[PDB]
């Protein structure tokens, strides 16, 4: 419903709200990472290419890539990964979270889109210190092996 | 009219101190304050600094008249600073103390960032 607009080219972001069916029949039924042209998103987005990427809803449960069903399905995730960054969770833990599907549909709240088109000396010491002691290792060999060999 | 003697005395220049078990005898006297013992120990060891002394664990044996305890004479106040438990310094007033309240000493604060 409510659009987040951000551009990487300038670095600026802001949020607006739309409520028009014939404006968003083209917004629906699309997945994460699909381009949308701003022609029809509103007469003052022409040329602007919006990218549907992200998007969470009311009850605050996000959309996840790869799950394609306009439901709120429960998934077992891994910490740090998409739609699961639980902190203080003893690495290797998994939780069964609630997520939305990846094809945008009616019951969301906030849809995120982005804009594609606007219409030393110490090291010098250490390298040869390593070379020095690795070569004294082999000199120590060629002493202390033959010392025993001669017997 | 009190006396003052030490025993079990050993000097370890590891922790740069001279450590003893003193065996004070104060017949008639109720007891002797540690402060009151400071000047006597200082003037019998000429430690050049009556603050290098830290004496404790006094008993006053059953029947009265004789008390024991430990004593620590440092040779640089620098070493007295560094090799000392935090509370004998506070007893001699060389440092001050603070108090705790441990609600979100760490618990609630482990939640936000």
């Amino acid at each position: 419903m409510k659009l987040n607009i951000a551009n990487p080219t300038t670095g600026c972001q802001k949020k607006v709200e739309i409520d028009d069916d014939m404006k968003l029949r083209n917004l629906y039924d699309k997945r994460i990472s699909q381009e949308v042209v701003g022609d029809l998103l509103g007469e003052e987005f022409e040329g602007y290419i919006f990218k549907i990427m992200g998007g969470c809803d009311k009850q605050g449960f996000p959309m996840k890539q790869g799950v394609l069903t306009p439901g709120r399905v429960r998934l077992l995730l891994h910490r740090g990964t998409s739609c699961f960054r639980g902190h203080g969770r003893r690495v290797g833990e998994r939780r069964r979270k609630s997520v939305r599907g990846c094809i945008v549909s009616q019951d969301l709240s906030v849809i995120n889109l982005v804009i594609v088109k606007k219409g030393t000396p110490l090291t010098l010491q250490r390298k040869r210190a390593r070379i020095a002691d690795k070569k004294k290792r082999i000199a120590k060999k060629k002493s202390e092996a033959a010392e025993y060999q001669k017997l | 009219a009190v006396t003052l003697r030490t025993r079990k005395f050993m000097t370890n220049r590891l922790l740069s101190r001279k450590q003893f078990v003193l065996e004070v005898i104060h017949p008639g006297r109720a007891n002797v304050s540690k402060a009151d013992l400071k000047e006597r120990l200082a003037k019998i060891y000429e430690v050049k600094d009556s603050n290098c002394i830290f004496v404790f664990k006094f008993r006053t044996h059953f029947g009265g008249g004789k008390s024991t305890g430990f004593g620590l004479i440092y040779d640089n106040l620098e070493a007295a600073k560094k090799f000392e438990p935090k509370y004998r310094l506070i007893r001699n007033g060389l440092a001050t103390k603070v108090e705790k309240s441990r609600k979100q000493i760490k618990e609630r604060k482990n939640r936000t960032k």
């Binding site: 010392e147 025993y148 | 220049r13 590891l14 922790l15 450590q19 090799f83 438990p85």
Partner: protein
């Protein structure tokens, strides 16, 4: 349990650590080190309890991370280091050497040494056998390993290890007729010259020993530790020359001590 046990409560701490019963719940729990943690003595028990150079846990921590303490000739910051038999502790601030030796009662003493009799240590060999590319090597009971060992050195023998060239300087062939200093069991501490060694197929081979003043005992091959070839040991024995004496005689010696005082 589900993993290593890292606390050792005070009453489980072995008998020869001499530490008292009511001083607290726990005991220093020697770290996994060069000595078997049942036949050891941690550095805290060395500093605090015996030498009294410190009076608490933290004070020994201060002693050790001043970098003052030395084991086998190299400084050691650990505080539950499992020192063992004939480990040398030097304190160069005090120019003072100890070599950690048993007494006849089975407890550790700190027998002092000079520098010439501190430059080296002494330990037996667990086993000599091959390694990578066919080079022989031996493994001691001290953890130490030696490569290219003197091809005469066998298992059960004893070696001296200088703390600068860090290799053999000599080795004593474990044999009848040279002195030992048993390091486990009831006979631990008692020095004495082997008179016999009997082997049994499939189990422990025992050594019969005599205290140079007559008394005779036996112990299996595990706890013998030959010191010197012949009667003369190559290490300065403690105050009582490794003779365990009856409790009656420990009474007579104290009577004779008081009657001349």
């Amino acid at each position: 349990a589900r993993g290593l046990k890292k606390h050792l409560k005070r009453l489980n701490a072995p008998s020869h650590w001499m530490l008292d019963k009511l001083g607290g719940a726990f005991a220093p729990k020697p770290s996994s080190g060069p000595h078997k943690a049942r036949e050891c003595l941690p550095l805290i028990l060395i500093l605090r309890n015996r030498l009294k150079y410190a009076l608490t846990y933290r004070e020994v921590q201060s002693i050790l991370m001043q970098r003052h303490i030395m084991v086998d000739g190299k400084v050691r910051t650990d505080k539950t280091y499992p020192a063992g038999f004939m480990d040398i502790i030097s304190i160069p601030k005090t120019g003072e050497n100890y070599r950690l030796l048993y007494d006849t009662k089975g407890r550790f003493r700190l027998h002092s040494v000079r520098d010439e009799d501190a430059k080296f240590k002494l330990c037996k060999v667990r086993s000599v056998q091959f390694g990578q590319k066919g080079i022989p090597y031996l493994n001691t009971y001290d953890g130490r390993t030696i490569r290219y060992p003197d091809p005469l050195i066998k298992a059960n023998d004893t070696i001296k290890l200088d703390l600068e060239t860090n290799k053999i300087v000599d080795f004593i062939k474990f044999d009848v007729g040279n002195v030992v200093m048993v390091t486990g069991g009831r006979n631990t501490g008692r020095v004495g010259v082997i008179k016999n060694r009997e082997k049994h197929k499939g189990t422990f081979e025992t050594i019969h020993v005599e205290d140079a003043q007559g008394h005779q005992f036996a112990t299996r091959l595990g706890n013998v530790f030959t010191i010197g070839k012949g009667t003369k040991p190559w290490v300065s024995l403690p105050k009582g020359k490794g003779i365990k004496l009856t409790i009656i005689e420990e009474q007579r010696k104290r009577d004779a001590a008081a009657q001349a005082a």
